Amino acid sequence: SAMDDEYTKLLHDGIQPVAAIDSNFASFTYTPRSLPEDDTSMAILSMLQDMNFINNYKIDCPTLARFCLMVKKGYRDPPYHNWMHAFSVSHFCYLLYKNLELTNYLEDIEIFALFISCMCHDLDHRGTNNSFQVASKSVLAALYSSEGSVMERHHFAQAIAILNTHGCNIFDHFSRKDYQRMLDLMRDIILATDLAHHLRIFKDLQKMAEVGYDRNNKQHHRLLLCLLMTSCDLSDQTKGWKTTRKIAELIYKEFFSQGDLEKAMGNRPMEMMDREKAYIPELQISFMEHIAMPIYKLLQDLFPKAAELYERVASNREHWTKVSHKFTIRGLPSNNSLDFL
Ligand SMILES: Cc1cc([C@@H]2CN(C(=O)c3ccc(F)cc3)CC(F)(F)C2)n2ncnc2n1
Ligand SMILES: [Mg+2]
Ligand SMILES: [Zn+2]
């Protein structure tokens, strides 16, 4: 009933101009988590319209409205891996489109697949990682653990189940070859969100940036799509310090909750998921140094206009070192009590 009325307005009221969402909506400085959640499905439509994908691919507006709502409704509400994460990852894809001239690098359909993949790439996340699915002998591991990337295979399978839901296949008028192409792209792009995949291809990403992007090289296209998706996935770290701090809070709430579950199973959590061992400033510096900063350095090497993104991640990294001293309790706790000992 609720989705029906939301559908009715999304379809019949018209698509809001993207500039009416916010004066800075298309800037790397904009924080899409600032958008009220109730406004995000209309913002998805506005972005799709502004990138001309609705007209170029003749997407049926009722199908697209239903698709967007079905995708939003396909996310659960863990602290981090929720619909607002998918919305902000999708928004960053729109930023790359508006700021970095992707049409000089990628086919139209590849850019479209990236954006749709961003919307779908964490569908039905339960707030636990791939190792946990295997350790807990979850249904998802029973399905996919022999292939790896258990959660990401599930996210892709969930996106297909939405497309296979009557009235929701935004691609169903595509040619057979274009349809196969779109779903293949979605597979590769969603599967690239496994950071284990990113780490596997990282040297090939380095090699691509070194020799220089070849628009006629099909492997360069695939590699670039993977890097862009990862850049979208981690894009929370490219905003201000306030965003980085809040996003850290959400990640560790989620992580520590999984760690609490691992302990109740008799298993030793990773220290970054153990609330009794994790030292957040050191983990955030490590994550920025070894994972986040190299990704945006690569993005800058390929796209010089992405320099500000790398400098932001580097800045946020310096902020963690500056505030680290505040995790040590000097003097007495604010209650004047040593009871916590
Ligand atoms: C935007 C953003 C996203 C993530 C994570 C990274 N991540 C990992 O596997 C991972 C690997 C090494 C680490 F040191 C920490 C986490 C997968 C995920 F949890 F899905 C999202 N983090 N993590 C810390 N700050 C983050 N900021
Ligand atoms: Mg994911
Ligand atoms: Zn994600």
Side-chain angles (χ1 to χ4, degrees):
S1 172
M3 178 181 160
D4 313 46
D5 183 42
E6 181 168 4
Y7 166 81
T8 291
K9 288 184 179 309
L10 198 57
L11 169 60
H12 289 276
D13 286 348
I15 299 177
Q16 187 177 44
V18 84
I21 305 179
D22 193 276
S23 65
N24 213 34
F25 192 74
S27 170
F28 285 136
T29 63
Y30 177 80
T31 49
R33 297 177 172 271
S34 292
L35 192 64
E37 192 159 11
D38 284 349
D39 297 330
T40 52
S41 298
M42 176 58 78
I44 288 287
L45 293 187
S46 303
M47 285 182 283
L48 287 170
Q49 166 68 10
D50 192 53
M51 300 182 282
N52 197 228
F53 288 144
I54 305 188
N55 171 247
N56 189 47
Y57 291 108
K58 291 305 192 284
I59 305 295
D60 179 66
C61 280
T63 305
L64 180 57
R66 207 176 285 105
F67 178 79
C68 291
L69 293 184
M70 289 285 296
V71 170
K72 172 162 76 177
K73 181 266 277 169
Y75 285 83
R76 306 194 194 195
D77 201 20
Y80 183 77
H81 283 109
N82 49 50
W83 161 251
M84 285 305 303
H85 173 241
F87 175 74
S88 65
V89 172
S90 300
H91 177 262
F92 191 76
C93 180
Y94 170 77
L95 291 182
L96 298 177
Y97 175 90
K98 298 288 293 187
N99 280 277
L100 291 191
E101 298 155 320
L102 291 180
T103 48
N104 291 326
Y105 299 78
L106 295 171
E107 294 173 351
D108 294 333
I109 197 165
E110 293 179 317
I111 298 169
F112 189 26
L114 185 55
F115 185 90
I116 294 294
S117 295
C118 282
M119 294 174 58
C120 296
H121 77 278
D122 277 318
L123 275 164
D124 199 40
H125 209 281
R126 300 83 186 279
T128 52
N129 70 349
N130 281 338
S131 174
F132 187 80
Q133 310 300 136
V134 173
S136 66
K137 293 181 199 301
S138 78
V139 172
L140 302 184
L143 300 183
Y144 307 126
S145 67
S146 84
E147 303 285 338
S149 308
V150 170
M151 287 312 308
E152 295 78 18
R153 281 184 150 79
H154 182 57
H155 305 314
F156 169 78
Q158 291 290 283
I160 301 307
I162 296 186
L163 290 169
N164 286 333
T165 302
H166 183 76
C168 301
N169 197 333
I170 56 174
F171 309 132
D172 63 348
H173 64 293
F174 279 19
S175 69
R176 179 186 337 104
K177 206 147 294 189
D178 291 316
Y179 188 78
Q180 283 176 17
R181 177 68 162 140
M182 174 63 69
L183 274 54
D184 190 44
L185 284 161
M186 293 180 59
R187 173 220 186 261
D188 291 346
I189 297 172
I190 292 165
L191 291 203
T193 61
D194 185 354
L195 285 173
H197 180 277
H198 166 63
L199 294 168
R200 277 197 294 282
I201 61 161
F202 178 84
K203 79 95 178 155
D204 285 327
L205 293 172
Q206 273 181 324
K207 291 188 179 194
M208 189 191 53
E210 288 178 14
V211 303
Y213 186 80
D214 185 349
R215 176 153 204 192
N216 297 137
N217 182 319
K218 291 289 178 289
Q219 180 64 16
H220 280 189
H221 281 242
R222 303 192 203 100
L223 282 176
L224 175 59
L225 282 165
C226 294
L227 173 68
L228 290 178
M229 176 70 241
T230 304
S231 294
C232 295
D233 212 2
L234 299 187
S235 65
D236 279 334
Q237 296 291 355
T238 65
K239 315 291 188 182
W241 162 254
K242 266 142 194 176
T243 294
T244 292
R245 190 248 248 173
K246 176 65 181 185
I247 265 40
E249 176 194 295
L250 294 180
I251 285 276
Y252 289 107
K253 286 197 227 230
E254 192 172 305
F255 280 8
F256 298 155
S257 289
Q258 169 184 328
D260 290 347
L261 294 182
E262 282 164 342
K263 289 172 184 194
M265 289 164 56
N267 295 341
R268 185 130 187 70
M270 300 182 60
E271 98 162 15
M272 76 173 61
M273 318 192 66
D274 188 331
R275 73 180 65 257
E276 302 306 319
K277 290 182 262 295
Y279 183 60
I280 287 177
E282 163 192 312
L283 296 166
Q284 283 301 97
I285 293 160
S286 291
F287 177 72
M288 299 299 253
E289 283 199 293
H290 299 98
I291 296 174
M293 272 161 48
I295 285 162
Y296 293 102
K297 187 66 195 197
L298 278 175
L299 194 68
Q300 152 159 17
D301 295 338
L302 293 153
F303 309 88
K305 283 198 277 168
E308 53 178 294
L309 302 168
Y310 171 72
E311 293 152 13
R312 275 275 82 177
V313 182
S315 288
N316 290 324
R317 191 279 226 196
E318 172 187 71
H319 278 255
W320 281 110
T321 81
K322 294 209 219 66
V323 303
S324 180
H325 76 275
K326 300 181 147 301
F327 283 67
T328 291
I329 297 175
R330 330 209 86 89
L332 285 161
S334 298
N335 59 351
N336 273 358
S337 182
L338 284 186
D339 287 351
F340 75 107
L341 289 184

PDB file of all heavy atoms in Angstrom, residues 6 14 41 78 85 131 176 182 187 211 222 224 244 248 252 256 259 261 264 270 289 293-294 303:
ATOM      1  N   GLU A   6       3.585   5.754  -3.004  1.00  0.00           N
ATOM      2  CA  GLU A   6       4.871   6.333  -3.358  1.00  0.00           C
ATOM      3  C   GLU A   6       5.140   6.172  -4.841  1.00  0.00           C
ATOM      4  O   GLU A   6       5.653   7.088  -5.493  1.00  0.00           O
ATOM      5  CB  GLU A   6       5.977   5.692  -2.536  1.00  0.00           C
ATOM      6  CG  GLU A   6       7.325   6.271  -2.858  1.00  0.00           C
ATOM      7  CD  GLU A   6       8.386   5.856  -1.865  1.00  0.00           C
ATOM      8  OE1 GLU A   6       8.075   5.047  -0.955  1.00  0.00           O
ATOM      9  OE2 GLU A   6       9.528   6.347  -2.007  1.00  0.00           O
ATOM     10  N   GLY A  14       5.963  13.861 -12.090  1.00  0.00           N
ATOM     11  CA  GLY A  14       7.001  14.412 -12.942  1.00  0.00           C
ATOM     12  C   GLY A  14       8.367  14.378 -12.267  1.00  0.00           C
ATOM     13  O   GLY A  14       8.488  14.349 -11.043  1.00  0.00           O
ATOM     14  N   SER A  41      14.495   8.520  -3.971  1.00  0.00           N
ATOM     15  CA  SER A  41      14.033   7.865  -5.200  1.00  0.00           C
ATOM     16  C   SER A  41      13.776   8.883  -6.301  1.00  0.00           C
ATOM     17  O   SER A  41      14.091   8.632  -7.471  1.00  0.00           O
ATOM     18  CB  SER A  41      12.776   7.039  -4.934  1.00  0.00           C
ATOM     19  OG  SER A  41      13.048   6.018  -3.997  1.00  0.00           O
ATOM     20  N   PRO A  78      20.966  -2.156   8.229  1.00  0.00           N
ATOM     21  CA  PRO A  78      22.139  -2.198   9.096  1.00  0.00           C
ATOM     22  C   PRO A  78      22.738  -0.804   9.172  1.00  0.00           C
ATOM     23  O   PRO A  78      22.323   0.089   8.421  1.00  0.00           O
ATOM     24  CB  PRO A  78      23.067  -3.195   8.387  1.00  0.00           C
ATOM     25  CG  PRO A  78      22.752  -2.992   6.929  1.00  0.00           C
ATOM     26  CD  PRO A  78      21.290  -2.637   6.868  1.00  0.00           C
ATOM     27  N   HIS A  85      23.489   4.140   1.809  1.00  0.00           N
ATOM     28  CA  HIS A  85      24.796   3.855   1.228  1.00  0.00           C
ATOM     29  C   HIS A  85      24.683   3.691  -0.284  1.00  0.00           C
ATOM     30  O   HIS A  85      25.458   4.291  -1.035  1.00  0.00           O
ATOM     31  CB  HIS A  85      25.420   2.604   1.843  1.00  0.00           C
ATOM     32  CG  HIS A  85      26.683   2.180   1.149  1.00  0.00           C
ATOM     33  ND1 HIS A  85      26.840   0.952   0.529  1.00  0.00           N
ATOM     34  CD2 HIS A  85      27.839   2.852   0.954  1.00  0.00           C
ATOM     35  CE1 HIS A  85      28.056   0.892   0.003  1.00  0.00           C
ATOM     36  NE2 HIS A  85      28.667   2.037   0.227  1.00  0.00           N
ATOM     37  N   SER A 131      33.356 -13.625   4.957  1.00  0.00           N
ATOM     38  CA  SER A 131      33.858 -14.638   5.882  1.00  0.00           C
ATOM     39  C   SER A 131      32.760 -15.110   6.829  1.00  0.00           C
ATOM     40  O   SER A 131      32.640 -16.313   7.100  1.00  0.00           O
ATOM     41  CB  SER A 131      35.050 -14.078   6.662  1.00  0.00           C
ATOM     42  OG  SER A 131      35.469 -14.988   7.672  1.00  0.00           O
ATOM     43  N   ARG A 176      18.306  -8.425 -27.746  1.00  0.00           N
ATOM     44  CA  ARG A 176      18.849  -9.559 -27.006  1.00  0.00           C
ATOM     45  C   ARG A 176      20.321  -9.347 -26.674  1.00  0.00           C
ATOM     46  O   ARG A 176      20.757  -9.595 -25.537  1.00  0.00           O
ATOM     47  CB  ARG A 176      18.663 -10.841 -27.810  1.00  0.00           C
ATOM     48  CG  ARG A 176      19.224 -12.081 -27.144  1.00  0.00           C
ATOM     49  CD  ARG A 176      19.137 -13.295 -28.073  1.00  0.00           C
ATOM     50  NE  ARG A 176      18.116 -13.154 -29.112  1.00  0.00           N
ATOM     51  CZ  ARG A 176      18.377 -12.886 -30.391  1.00  0.00           C
ATOM     52  NH1 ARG A 176      19.629 -12.723 -30.797  1.00  0.00           N
ATOM     53  NH2 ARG A 176      17.384 -12.775 -31.264  1.00  0.00           N
ATOM     54  N   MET A 182      24.057  -5.747 -20.863  1.00  0.00           N
ATOM     55  CA  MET A 182      23.767  -5.033 -19.623  1.00  0.00           C
ATOM     56  C   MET A 182      23.907  -5.947 -18.415  1.00  0.00           C
ATOM     57  O   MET A 182      24.532  -5.576 -17.417  1.00  0.00           O
ATOM     58  CB  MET A 182      22.359  -4.426 -19.675  1.00  0.00           C
ATOM     59  CG  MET A 182      21.932  -3.784 -18.370  1.00  0.00           C
ATOM     60  SD  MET A 182      22.942  -2.360 -17.863  1.00  0.00           S
ATOM     61  CE  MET A 182      22.502  -1.146 -19.113  1.00  0.00           C
ATOM     62  N   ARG A 187      26.916  -7.934 -13.687  1.00  0.00           N
ATOM     63  CA  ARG A 187      27.660  -8.973 -12.983  1.00  0.00           C
ATOM     64  C   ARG A 187      29.075  -8.510 -12.657  1.00  0.00           C
ATOM     65  O   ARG A 187      29.508  -8.551 -11.496  1.00  0.00           O
ATOM     66  CB  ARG A 187      27.709 -10.251 -13.807  1.00  0.00           C
ATOM     67  CG  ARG A 187      28.605 -11.258 -13.181  1.00  0.00           C
ATOM     68  CD  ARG A 187      29.406 -11.985 -14.206  1.00  0.00           C
ATOM     69  NE  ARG A 187      30.176 -13.066 -13.608  1.00  0.00           N
ATOM     70  CZ  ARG A 187      31.462 -12.966 -13.298  1.00  0.00           C
ATOM     71  NH1 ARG A 187      32.112 -11.824 -13.514  1.00  0.00           N
ATOM     72  NH2 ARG A 187      32.089 -14.000 -12.758  1.00  0.00           N
ATOM     73  N   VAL A 211      50.746   2.834 -18.614  1.00  0.00           N
ATOM     74  CA  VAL A 211      50.832   2.884 -20.067  1.00  0.00           C
ATOM     75  C   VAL A 211      49.836   3.871 -20.648  1.00  0.00           C
ATOM     76  O   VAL A 211      50.045   4.368 -21.761  1.00  0.00           O
ATOM     77  CB  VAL A 211      50.627   1.485 -20.682  1.00  0.00           C
ATOM     78  CG1 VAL A 211      51.647   0.505 -20.114  1.00  0.00           C
ATOM     79  CG2 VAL A 211      49.213   0.997 -20.457  1.00  0.00           C
ATOM     80  N   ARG A 222      37.042  -2.782 -18.953  1.00  0.00           N
ATOM     81  CA  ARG A 222      36.602  -3.562 -17.798  1.00  0.00           C
ATOM     82  C   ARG A 222      37.329  -3.116 -16.542  1.00  0.00           C
ATOM     83  O   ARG A 222      36.725  -3.005 -15.468  1.00  0.00           O
ATOM     84  CB  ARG A 222      36.852  -5.058 -18.019  1.00  0.00           C
ATOM     85  CG  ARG A 222      36.201  -5.662 -19.257  1.00  0.00           C
ATOM     86  CD  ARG A 222      36.280  -7.192 -19.195  1.00  0.00           C
ATOM     87  NE  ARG A 222      36.184  -7.805 -20.515  1.00  0.00           N
ATOM     88  CZ  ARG A 222      37.227  -8.240 -21.215  1.00  0.00           C
ATOM     89  NH1 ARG A 222      38.452  -8.140 -20.718  1.00  0.00           N
ATOM     90  NH2 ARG A 222      37.043  -8.782 -22.412  1.00  0.00           N
ATOM     91  N   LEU A 224      38.749  -0.183 -15.954  1.00  0.00           N
ATOM     92  CA  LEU A 224      38.296   1.149 -15.567  1.00  0.00           C
ATOM     93  C   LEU A 224      36.947   1.090 -14.863  1.00  0.00           C
ATOM     94  O   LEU A 224      36.727   1.804 -13.882  1.00  0.00           O
ATOM     95  CB  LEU A 224      38.220   2.066 -16.801  1.00  0.00           C
ATOM     96  CG  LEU A 224      37.628   3.457 -16.504  1.00  0.00           C
ATOM     97  CD1 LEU A 224      38.439   4.220 -15.446  1.00  0.00           C
ATOM     98  CD2 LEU A 224      37.459   4.292 -17.807  1.00  0.00           C
ATOM     99  N   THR A 244      33.427  11.710   7.238  1.00  0.00           N
ATOM    100  CA  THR A 244      34.338  10.598   7.512  1.00  0.00           C
ATOM    101  C   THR A 244      34.143  10.070   8.930  1.00  0.00           C
ATOM    102  O   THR A 244      34.123   8.852   9.155  1.00  0.00           O
ATOM    103  CB  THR A 244      35.786  11.047   7.287  1.00  0.00           C
ATOM    104  OG1 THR A 244      35.992  11.293   5.891  1.00  0.00           O
ATOM    105  CG2 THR A 244      36.788  10.001   7.761  1.00  0.00           C
ATOM    106  N   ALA A 248      32.665   6.422   9.771  1.00  0.00           N
ATOM    107  CA  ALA A 248      33.429   5.516  10.624  1.00  0.00           C
ATOM    108  C   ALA A 248      32.551   4.954  11.735  1.00  0.00           C
ATOM    109  O   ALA A 248      32.580   3.749  12.020  1.00  0.00           O
ATOM    110  CB  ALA A 248      34.646   6.244  11.204  1.00  0.00           C
ATOM    111  N   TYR A 252      31.826   0.858  12.089  1.00  0.00           N
ATOM    112  CA  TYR A 252      32.244   0.073  13.251  1.00  0.00           C
ATOM    113  C   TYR A 252      31.056  -0.414  14.073  1.00  0.00           C
ATOM    114  O   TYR A 252      31.133  -1.502  14.651  1.00  0.00           O
ATOM    115  CB  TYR A 252      33.265   0.858  14.088  1.00  0.00           C
ATOM    116  CG  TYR A 252      34.561   0.921  13.323  1.00  0.00           C
ATOM    117  CD1 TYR A 252      34.981   2.101  12.721  1.00  0.00           C
ATOM    118  CD2 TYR A 252      35.320  -0.231  13.118  1.00  0.00           C
ATOM    119  CE1 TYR A 252      36.139   2.149  11.978  1.00  0.00           C
ATOM    120  CE2 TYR A 252      36.476  -0.196  12.369  1.00  0.00           C
ATOM    121  CZ  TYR A 252      36.879   0.999  11.794  1.00  0.00           C
ATOM    122  OH  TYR A 252      38.030   1.045  11.041  1.00  0.00           O
ATOM    123  N   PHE A 256      31.254  -4.205  14.695  1.00  0.00           N
ATOM    124  CA  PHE A 256      31.284  -4.739  16.049  1.00  0.00           C
ATOM    125  C   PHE A 256      30.069  -5.607  16.329  1.00  0.00           C
ATOM    126  O   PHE A 256      30.163  -6.564  17.104  1.00  0.00           O
ATOM    127  CB  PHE A 256      31.378  -3.602  17.071  1.00  0.00           C
ATOM    128  CG  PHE A 256      32.626  -2.775  16.947  1.00  0.00           C
ATOM    129  CD1 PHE A 256      32.646  -1.458  17.393  1.00  0.00           C
ATOM    130  CD2 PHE A 256      33.778  -3.315  16.408  1.00  0.00           C
ATOM    131  CE1 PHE A 256      33.785  -0.699  17.283  1.00  0.00           C
ATOM    132  CE2 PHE A 256      34.921  -2.561  16.284  1.00  0.00           C
ATOM    133  CZ  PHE A 256      34.928  -1.247  16.732  1.00  0.00           C
ATOM    134  N   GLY A 259      31.046  -8.833  15.043  1.00  0.00           N
ATOM    135  CA  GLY A 259      31.999  -9.402  15.974  1.00  0.00           C
ATOM    136  C   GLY A 259      31.324  -9.957  17.207  1.00  0.00           C
ATOM    137  O   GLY A 259      31.678 -11.038  17.687  1.00  0.00           O
ATOM    138  N   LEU A 261      28.477 -11.264  17.307  1.00  0.00           N
ATOM    139  CA  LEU A 261      27.889 -12.537  16.897  1.00  0.00           C
ATOM    140  C   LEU A 261      28.948 -13.623  16.749  1.00  0.00           C
ATOM    141  O   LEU A 261      28.707 -14.785  17.101  1.00  0.00           O
ATOM    142  CB  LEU A 261      27.129 -12.367  15.586  1.00  0.00           C
ATOM    143  CG  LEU A 261      25.908 -11.460  15.695  1.00  0.00           C
ATOM    144  CD1 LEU A 261      25.187 -11.382  14.352  1.00  0.00           C
ATOM    145  CD2 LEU A 261      24.996 -11.964  16.816  1.00  0.00           C
ATOM    146  N   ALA A 264      29.664 -14.977  20.192  1.00  0.00           N
ATOM    147  CA  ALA A 264      28.615 -15.869  20.673  1.00  0.00           C
ATOM    148  C   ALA A 264      28.619 -17.216  19.958  1.00  0.00           C
ATOM    149  O   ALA A 264      27.963 -18.147  20.432  1.00  0.00           O
ATOM    150  CB  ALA A 264      27.247 -15.198  20.532  1.00  0.00           C
ATOM    151  N   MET A 270      37.932 -10.919  13.734  1.00  0.00           N
ATOM    152  CA  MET A 270      38.974  -9.993  13.329  1.00  0.00           C
ATOM    153  C   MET A 270      39.043  -8.867  14.344  1.00  0.00           C
ATOM    154  O   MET A 270      38.021  -8.460  14.901  1.00  0.00           O
ATOM    155  CB  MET A 270      38.681  -9.415  11.945  1.00  0.00           C
ATOM    156  CG  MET A 270      38.585 -10.417  10.822  1.00  0.00           C
ATOM    157  SD  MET A 270      38.283  -9.530   9.283  1.00  0.00           S
ATOM    158  CE  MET A 270      39.739  -8.485   9.214  1.00  0.00           C
ATOM    159  N   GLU A 289      45.489   4.603   4.292  1.00  0.00           N
ATOM    160  CA  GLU A 289      46.833   4.490   3.730  1.00  0.00           C
ATOM    161  C   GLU A 289      46.918   3.376   2.699  1.00  0.00           C
ATOM    162  O   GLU A 289      47.506   3.551   1.627  1.00  0.00           O
ATOM    163  CB  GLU A 289      47.847   4.220   4.834  1.00  0.00           C
ATOM    164  CG  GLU A 289      48.229   5.390   5.656  1.00  0.00           C
ATOM    165  CD  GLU A 289      49.524   5.125   6.380  1.00  0.00           C
ATOM    166  OE1 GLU A 289      49.540   4.246   7.266  1.00  0.00           O
ATOM    167  OE2 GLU A 289      50.527   5.771   6.030  1.00  0.00           O
ATOM    168  N   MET A 293      43.482   5.667  -0.077  1.00  0.00           N
ATOM    169  CA  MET A 293      44.359   6.593  -0.791  1.00  0.00           C
ATOM    170  C   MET A 293      44.882   6.030  -2.104  1.00  0.00           C
ATOM    171  O   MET A 293      44.857   6.769  -3.102  1.00  0.00           O
ATOM    172  CB  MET A 293      45.503   7.044   0.123  1.00  0.00           C
ATOM    173  CG  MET A 293      45.121   8.256   0.935  1.00  0.00           C
ATOM    174  SD  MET A 293      46.164   8.503   2.382  1.00  0.00           S
ATOM    175  CE  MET A 293      47.793   8.309   1.659  1.00  0.00           C
ATOM    176  N   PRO A 294      45.348   4.775  -2.190  1.00  0.00           N
ATOM    177  CA  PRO A 294      45.811   4.265  -3.497  1.00  0.00           C
ATOM    178  C   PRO A 294      44.731   4.241  -4.561  1.00  0.00           C
ATOM    179  O   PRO A 294      45.032   4.449  -5.746  1.00  0.00           O
ATOM    180  CB  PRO A 294      46.295   2.850  -3.161  1.00  0.00           C
ATOM    181  CG  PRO A 294      46.728   2.949  -1.734  1.00  0.00           C
ATOM    182  CD  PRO A 294      45.707   3.848  -1.099  1.00  0.00           C
ATOM    183  N   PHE A 303      42.362  10.491 -14.300  1.00  0.00           N
ATOM    184  CA  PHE A 303      41.560  11.698 -14.488  1.00  0.00           C
ATOM    185  C   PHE A 303      42.154  12.815 -13.646  1.00  0.00           C
ATOM    186  O   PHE A 303      41.906  12.875 -12.428  1.00  0.00           O
ATOM    187  CB  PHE A 303      40.103  11.462 -14.100  1.00  0.00           C
ATOM    188  CG  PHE A 303      39.484  10.249 -14.737  1.00  0.00           C
ATOM    189  CD1 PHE A 303      39.581   9.003 -14.136  1.00  0.00           C
ATOM    190  CD2 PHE A 303      38.787  10.362 -15.924  1.00  0.00           C
ATOM    191  CE1 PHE A 303      39.001   7.885 -14.714  1.00  0.00           C
ATOM    192  CE2 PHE A 303      38.202   9.248 -16.512  1.00  0.00           C
ATOM    193  CZ  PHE A 303      38.312   8.008 -15.904  1.00  0.00           C
TER     194      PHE A 303
END
